[PDB]
Amino acid sequence: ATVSMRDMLKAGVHFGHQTRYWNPKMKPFIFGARNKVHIINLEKTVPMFNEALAELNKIASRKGKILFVGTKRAASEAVKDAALSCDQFFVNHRWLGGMLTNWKTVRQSIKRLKDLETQSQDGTFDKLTKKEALMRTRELEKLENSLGGIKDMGGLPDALFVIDADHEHIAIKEANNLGIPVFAIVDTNSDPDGVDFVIPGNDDAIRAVTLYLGAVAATVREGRSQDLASQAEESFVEAE
Amino acid sequence: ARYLGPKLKLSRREGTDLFLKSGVRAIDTKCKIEQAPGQHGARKPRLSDYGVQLREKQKVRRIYGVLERQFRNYYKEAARLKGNTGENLLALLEGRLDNVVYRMGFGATRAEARQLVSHKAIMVNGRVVNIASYQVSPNDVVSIREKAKKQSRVKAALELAEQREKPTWLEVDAGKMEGTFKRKPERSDLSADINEHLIVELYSK
Amino acid sequence: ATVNQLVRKPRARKVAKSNVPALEACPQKRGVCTRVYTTTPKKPNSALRKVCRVRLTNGFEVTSYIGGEGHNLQEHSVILIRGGRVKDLPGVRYHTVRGALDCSGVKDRKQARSKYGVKRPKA
Amino acid sequence: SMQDPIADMLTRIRNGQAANKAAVTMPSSKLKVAIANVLKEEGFIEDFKVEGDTKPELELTLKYFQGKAVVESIQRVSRPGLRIYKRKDELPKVMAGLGIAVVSTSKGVMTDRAARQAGLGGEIICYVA
Amino acid sequence: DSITSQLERRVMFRRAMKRAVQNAMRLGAKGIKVEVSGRLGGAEIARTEWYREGRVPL
Amino acid sequence: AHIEKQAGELQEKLIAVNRVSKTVKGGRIFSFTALTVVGDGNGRVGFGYGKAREVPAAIQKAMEKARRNMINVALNNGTLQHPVKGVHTGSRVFMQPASEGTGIIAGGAMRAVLEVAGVHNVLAKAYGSTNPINVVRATIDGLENMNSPEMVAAKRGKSVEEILGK
RNA sequence: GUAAAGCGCACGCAGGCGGUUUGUUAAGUCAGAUGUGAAAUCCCCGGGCUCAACCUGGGAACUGCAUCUGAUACUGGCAAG
RNA sequence: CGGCCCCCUGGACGAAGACUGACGCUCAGGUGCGAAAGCGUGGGGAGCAAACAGGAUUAGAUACCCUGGUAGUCCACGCCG
């Protein structure tokens, strides 16, 4: 399945932008600097990436729903491009690390958002005084920004897609405790964690990260469409 | 050696009647025992590892009609003829002449039963054996000395006892004032609260 | 360190099982009282507590607390002493045996009679 | 100089697993070879080769076929300096019989089971933990 | 009355007051505030406790 | 966060409970402390000291700190057979290789802690801090492998993959 | 490291230790061979005096010793690398 | 150990040609060795400065903060380093 190897090379040819310093624990997949810029070994990452993209395919028939985490002020647009659906959920700009174990609160703020979003949208948000009505509009905004990558999600995700292992140490802990496996894409100047499967890679600038995540998503996403179309065909066969 | 004195007190903690003072007053009914005894009972008590050990040694002293001091010799013999120590110690506790006398019915209490030992009303092998600590084994015969086969209190005790204190490991006859002890029991037959292997771990260290 | 090193350098050791001082390798010993001190002790917790210096019959001199209950000791009496430190009181490595000789406790008894004193009142 | 090459052998296996390798190579004693065979048949090492340069040299393969699971450290007890020798009857199964002693007997190096069934004593080389 | 009754008979006051609140808001209170005092714990000096839940604006 | 052994249904063995304070104007402490060891009534890892505004939260903190938010070294089955020493955060428990099952004796509340911990089968003396809030670590420092099962073929357990790897 | 505790530092004989290979030896190593190790109150197996305490026959770690024979897997001695 | 250099000389740090072949490791005993002042005798003392004087500080002011000012600080070898 040569198709995974095309995307890895097609992404990987930005040759880095960061200095000749790298995370010691990534050292195997790192080729030597050219004039003080870090260059990943491109060939040595192409065998990893093919193993990863078949594993994503197998979980497509297990899949509930996907949660793209590790979002931050530079990685969001690259997650926007990855999702292409609402079978898979995301936020744009920032992410609050951990949702998996304090779900109690998280479902209680989703119910506060959708109640007050429906009052705002009808035009019936105005009660007591205008001060109070504007003060509620101001809390509706605040919820929307706090909630954007969960405010549509049906429960807890069957896998977790992390681009940034570095502010997500608490989310990875909690996800594993809920009995969910992590599928990770780690940088050459970031430390890899306690995760179940890794894509070794380099996430410098918007042109690499949109493709890595897009390749990861295709296998699993169109797997999911085909498992669901099969559930239709296993029942409809009876009636035909 | 029969201790008695402050006798009921140890049952009043224990919640077993310890076989001392039975009848119509073994655990409650006309006995005032654990029905709010005293002028206190509001506070939380505290236990330790030495507290459950102490409680279980207290149980076993009175149910066999023995002492701490008697039980030290019972251990000095348990080690000397070696096996599992806790098993050995109970064989010897249950092997007392006072306990064969008690389970047959000839006194329906520990104090009664041991009195009929000591006060020469009990004979083993047709000779008077006045020692409660005398060792008795399967298919041995206990019988009653002549000038004590006129006890009104013996006759009375056997009938209080009739198929409520009398076990199946023995035989007795209430007319002839004599019986055969046919089998020495172990903890599977008896009560299973007392434990004698744990008490030897305490006294060894 | 090595194991060899330790044969060549002997260890420093103390007894972890004894610390209260005691004379003639025994639990009790006799001496005549010399002096009594009303004294105020170590710690912010304070009383006018009563202690004696006693002159033992084995050639040492120690200060002992009058324990058990009360103060009934005379200043020159031959009394029986027992090792046992009564912590914050001055120079107290010993206590006085309330049931022996000139010593006796105060008021009835529901306690010991070895220490606290008095002949039999109850079981 | 290092006095013990057999402490080094063990340190090579330990640090071998910790550094996420699969092989460790070193200079070899006759004694080292004789040791590696008992470990290999007792399944605490996987394989070895013997190869020459200027003297004999041992290359071995780790218990990183499966990582860590019952053994987390292997240490030698009769070394340079402190030695302890054990008789034919007191050859131990270390860790309440969740382990072995590697035992040099006057017949050659074998495990504690086989030295005791034969009733042969000697010098107790190394334990697993 | 119901939270003093526990305390009078020395049963509970650590959770007796919280079940009061639970039982109150389920019939219609948008919020309840509770303060328990007395000689709580059998202590020779006086103690306080308090608990607020929902809203009690003043 | 931190993952533990199997259980089904849990026993909240509260061994000790206490109260803290430093009450003053504005920012203050006034909470309660609780100590619990969590297990299944034969053998499990998990130990938590926690605290909160009152007795109900204090205990729920403590039961969370056992089950998560705590570094432990693992057990398999409700019995020990890898008796060895160790240190975890200064607290030292020593266990010499001897009989399983019988010989169990440990003072105060510690004989009850050892029954939920899985190391009441093999045990020996403690050193370091001798307080019951920190020495319950028996199944952690006193067990330096992640499984110690009841079949003696445990020492052939890793062996069967090693000689197949030959 | 800081809790009591690394020599103030180098160089290095005596003692302790000894990479790697062969020859050679066998102090310690272990196995073999055989003798000694009274007596119970201790221990293990018996037994008796009303049980027991107590005393005891046989066996014994007699917690202690003995030397020859054999070995070279180990460390030590010595010779050339 | 502080300007920088030379003369004598130690020690390190690289690298090729070439050379010996455990000549190794550690180190009771051990001889040898000073940051500073102290210090024996010699040189030196421009500035600064303990004391001593006198101010200023203050519930007092030996501490604080100041001014004069001597030994000292500065060199060479030496003494328990």
How would you write chain C as a 3-class SS string? CCHHHHHHCCCCCCCCCCCCCCCCCCCEEEEEEEEEEEECCCCCCCCCEEEEEEEECCCCEEEEECCCCCCCCCCCCEEEEEECCCCCCCCEEEEECCCCCCCCCCCCCCCCCCCCCCCCCCC
Residue type, B173: D
> Both tokens of residue F99?
């009989």
> What burial letters (b/e) apply to A219-234, b meaning 16+ CB within 10 Å?
bbbebbeeeeeeeeee
Rounded-to-integer distance, Cα B117 and Cα B129, Å? 7
DSSP letter at B44 equals P
Q: How far apart are CA D104 and CA D117, in angstroms?
A: 15
* Strand G bases with any atom < 7 A from protein Cβ: 6, 16-22, 28-32, 43-46, 50-53, 70-75, 81
Same domain, B75 and B121: no
C-alpha distance from residue D120 to each of A13, A221, D109 (Å): 67, 67, 11
Burial class (CB in 10 A: 0-12, 13-18, 19+), D58: buried
Residue B186 CA from chain centroid, whole number: 14
Sequence-distant contacts of D52-60: CB under 8 A, at least 24 apart: D55/D27, D55/D28, D56/D28, D56/D30, D57/D25, D57/D26, D57/D27, D57/D28, D58/D25, D58/D26, D58/D27, D58/D28, D58/D32, D58/D33, D59/D23, D59/D24, D59/D25, D60/D12, D60/D13, D60/D23, D60/D24, D60/D25, D60/D36
- The DSSP output letter for B96 is B
Taking every pair of C-alpha atoms in chain E, what is the biggest distance, in angstroms? 39
> What burial letters (b/e) apply to A47-64, b meaning 16+ CB within 10 Å?
ebbeebbeebeebbeebb
Distance C6 CA to H81 C1' (A): 29
- Ramachandran class of A36: left when φ > 0, alpha when ψ lies in -120 to 50, beta otherwise: left
CA-wise closest residue to A198 among A210, A188, A208, A211: A188
Query: How many residues comprise chain D?
Result: 129
φ and ψ at residue A25, rounded to 5 degrees: -80, -15
* Protein CA at A68 to nucleotide C1' at G4, angstroms: 56
Q: Is B139 within 8 Å of B171 (Cβ atoms)?
A: no
Contact (CB, 8 A) for F59 and F36: yes
Q: Is D82 on the interface with C (CB under 8 A)?
A: yes
DSSP secondary structure code for residue B135 in this structure? B
Claim to verify: residue B55 and residue B133 sit in the same structural domain: no
Residue from A221, A202, A206 nearest A19 by CA: A202
User: Which alpha helices (DSSP H) does chain D contain, by range?
Assistant: 6-18, 30-41, 112-118
Q: E18-50 b/e with 16+ CB inside 10 Å = b?
A: bebbeeeeeeeeeebebebeeeeeeeeeeeeee
Query: Which nucleotide is at minimal CA–C1' distance from D6?
Result: G19
Q: What single-letter amino acid sits at C17? A: K
**Residue B6, CB half-sphere, CA atoms under 13 Å: how many?**
5
> Measured in angstroms, what separates residue C24's CA from nucleotide G3's C1'?
38
Single-letter amino acid code for the residue at D58: L
Q: How far apart are CA C71 and CA A28, in angstroms?
A: 85
Q: What is the separation, in whole angstroms, between the first and last Cα of chain B?
A: 28
Instruction: Of A19, A54, A20, give the one whose Cα is nearest residue A218.
Output: A54
Distance CA F102, CA F100 (A): 6
Q: In what order do the strands lie in the sheet with B178-181?
A: B127-128, B122-124, B140-144, B178-181, B170-173
**Residue D125 CA, nucleotide G30 C1', distance (Å):** 14
Which residues are D24's β-sheet partners?
D60
Nucleotides of strand H lying closer than 7 angstroms to a protein CB? 22, 24-25
Q: How many CB atoms lie within 10 A of CB C110?
A: 7
CATH architecture of D72-129: 2-Layer Sandwich (3.30)
Which parts of the protein come within 7 Å of strand H, by CB position? Answer: D 1, 3
Supply A209's token pair: 């990260």
Q: Please tell me whether residues B72 and B107 are part of one structural domain.
A: no
Angle between helices B85-94 and B68-80 (to 10 degrees): 120
Kindly report the nearest CA distance between residue D128 and chain F, in angstroms. Answer: 10
Give me the number of domains chain B comprises: 2
Residues in chain B, how many? 205
DSSP B45: P
Q: How far apart are CA A166 and CA A79, in angstroms?
A: 17
Breaks in chain D (C–N beyond 2.5 Å) sit after none
Neighbours of C59 (CB within 10 A): 8
Q: Which two tokens stand for residue F1?
A: 């966060």
Nearest nt (C1') from D107 Cα = G73
CA distance F36 to chain E (A): 19
C94 token code pair: 């010993």
Q: Does residue D58 belong to the interface with chain F, where contact is any CB pair within 8 Å?
A: no
| Residue B1 domain flag | no
DSSP string of A101-135? S-HHHHHHHHHHHHHHHHHHHHT----S-HHHHHH
| Coil/strand/helix, residue D80 | coil
CB atoms within 10 A of CB B157: 24
Euclidean distance between CA atoms F18 and F23, whole angstroms: 16
Contact present, E40 and E16 (Cβ < 8 Å): no
Tell whether D68 lies on the interface with F, counting CB pairs under 8 A: yes
Q: How far apart are CA D22 and CA D61, in angstroms?
A: 6
Secondary structure letter of residue B43 according to DSSP: S
Start-end of H helices in B15-105: 49-63, 68-80, 85-94, 97-104
- Residues belonging to chain E: 58
Contact present, F19 and F25 (Cβ < 8 Å): no
B146: which 2 tokens? 């002549």
Core vs surface per residue B59-80: b (16+ CB within 10 A) or e? bbbbbbbbeeebbeebbeebee
Q: What is the dihedral of CA A25, A29, A32, A38, to 10 degrees?
A: -80
CATH number (domain holding residue B34): 1.10.1050.10
- Yes or no, beta carbons of D65 and F162 under 8 Å apart: yes
Kindly state the tokens that stand for F29.
């402490």
Within this chain, do residues B154 and B173 fall inside the same structural domain, yes or no?
yes
Two domains, one topology: D1-71 and D72-129:
no
Main-chain dihedrals φ then ψ at residue F161, nearest 5 degrees? -80, -25
Residue F92 contacts residue F141 (beta carbons within 8 Å): yes
Q: Is the dihedral angle over the CA atoms C62, C63, C67, C72 positive or is it negative?
A: positive
Count of CB atoms within 10 A of residue C55's CB? Answer: 17
* CATH number for position B164: 3.10.290.10
Whether B and F touch, i.e. at least 3 CB pairs below 8 A, reads as yes
Cα–Cα separations (whole angstroms), residue A98 to A103, A144, A172, B198: 9, 17, 8, 50
Measured distance CA(B197)–CA(A183) in Å, rounded: 56
CB-based contact A182:A176 (threshold 8 Å): yes
CA distance E13 to E5: 10
Q: Is the dihedral of CA B45, B48, B54, B57 positive or negative?
A: positive
Question: Could you tell me if A174 lies within 8 Å of chain F, comparing CB atoms?
Answer: yes
Cβ F17 vs Cβ F36: under 8 Å = no
**Contacts with F, A 133-172, CB within 8 Å:** 170
Domain ranges of chain D: 1-71, 72-129
Q: How far is the alpha carbon of C9 from chain D, nearest alpha carbon, in Å? A: 16
Instruction: Please check whether residue F2 touches A, CB under 8 A.
Output: yes
- Which residue shows structure tokens 């007796």? E16
Please tell me the number of Cα atoms within 13 Å of C51 on its side-chain side: 23
* Sign, Cα dihedral of A13, A17, A22, A25: negative
The values of phi and psi at residue D26, to 5°, are: -155, 160
Contacts of E53 in chain F (CB under 8 A): none
Q: Which residues contact A89 (CB under 8 A, 6 or more apart)?
A: A65, A66, A67, A68, A83, A149, A150, A152, A153, A157
- Do residue F82 and residue D72 have CB atoms under 8 angstroms apart? no
What is the three-class DSSP state of B179? Answer: strand
Tokens of F104: 């169990």
Nearest-by-Cβ selection for D66 from F81, F100, F158: F158
- Quick one: B59 and B18 in the same domain? yes
- Say how far apart CA F131 and CA E20 lie, in whole Å: 38
In chain A, where the domains are located: 28-95+159-225, 96-147
Q: How far apart are CA D100 and CA F158, in angstroms?
A: 13
Could you tell me the resolution of this structure in angstroms? 14.7
Domain boundaries, given as residue ranges, for chain C:
1-123
Distance of C1' in G56 from CA in B76, Å: 17
> Three-class SS of residue D93?
coil
C5 interfaces chain D, CB cutoff of 8 Å: no
Closest alpha carbon to F100 in D97, B203, D99, B86:
D97
Q: List the structure tokens of B110.
A: 């520990």
Q: Residue F125: its chain B contacts at CB < 8 A?
A: none
Nearest to F16 by CA among F143, F132, F94: F132
Nearest to B48 among F102, F105, F107 (CB): F107
H/E segment holding residue B200: helix B197-202
Q: Which residues of D touch C4 (CB under 8 A)?
A: 81-82
Alpha helices by DSSP H, listed for E9-54, are 16-27
Report the neighbours of F using a cutoff of 3 or more CB pairs below 8 angstroms: A, B, D, E
Tell me if F159 and D129 make a contact (CB, 8 A cut-off).
Answer: no
How close is the nearest chain F Cα to the Cα of D1, in Å? Answer: 32
Query: Alpha carbon C123 to chain centroid distance?
Result: 27
Q: Which tokens in the block code for residue D110?
A: 């074998």
With vertex at residue A91, the alpha carbon angle to CA A54 and CA A227, rounded to the nearest 5 degrees, is 35
**Which positions ≥6 away from A36 have C-beta within 8 Å?**
A19, A20
Q: Which CATH class is domain C1-123?
A: mainly beta
Residue B29 lies in a domain: yes
Contacts of C3 in chain D (CB under 8 A): 81-82
Assess F163–D contact: CB distance below 8 Å, yes or no: yes
On whether the CB atoms of residues A37 and A198 are closer than 8 A, the answer is no
Distance from CA of F64 to the nearest CA of A (A): 11
Range of the domain at B138: 94-181
| Same domain? B62 vs B107 | no
Q: Distance (Å, rounded) from C-alpha F61 to C-alpha F31?
A: 12
> For D38 and G27, how far is CA from C1' in angstroms?
29
Is residue A150 within 8 Å of A99, Cβ to Cβ? yes
CA of C65 vs C1' of H61, distance in Å?
49
A57: left (phi over 0), alpha (psi -120 to 50) or beta: alpha
Residue position matching structure tokens 């909690």: A174
Cα B25 from Cα D71, distance rounded (Å): 63
Residue of F nearest to B84 (CA): F102
Subunits in contact with chain C (3 or more CB pairs closer than 8 Å):
D
User: Maximum distance among all alpha carbons in chain C?
Assistant: 65
Contact A74, A95 (CB under 8 A): no
DSSP letter for each residue of chain F: -------SS-EEEEEEEEE-----SSS----EEEEEEEE-SS----EEEEEESSHHHHHHHHHHHHHSS-------SS--------EETTEEE---S--SSS----TTTHHHHHHHHT-SSS---EES---TTTS--HHHHT--SS---SSGGGGTTTHHHHTT--
* Phi, psi at D23, each rounded to 5°: -125, 155
Strand order in the sheet with F47-52: F11-19, F32-39, F47-52
Measured distance CA(D89)–CA(D122) in Å, rounded: 11
* CATH fold label, D1-71: Ribosomal Protein S8; Chain: A, domain 1 (3.30.1370)
Smallest CA–CA distance, residue D79 to chain C, in Å, is 12
* Chain B interface, best mutation among F14, F110, F111, F125, by max B CB count within 10 A: F111
- As a whole number of angstroms, the distance between CA C90 and CA F85 comes to 44
Q: What is the DSSP string of chain A?
A: -THHHHHHHHHHTT---SBS---GGGGGGEEEEETTEEEE-SGGGHHHHHHHHHHHHHHTTT-S-EEEE---TTTHHHHHHHH-SSSEE--SS---S--SS-HHHHHHHHHHHHHHHHHHHHT----S-HHHHHHHHHHHHHHHHHHTTTTT--SS-SEEEES-SSS-HHHHHHHHHTT--EEEEE-TTS---S-SEEEE----HHHHHHHHHHHHHHHHHHHHHHHHHHHHHHHHHHH-
| Structure determined by | cryo-EM
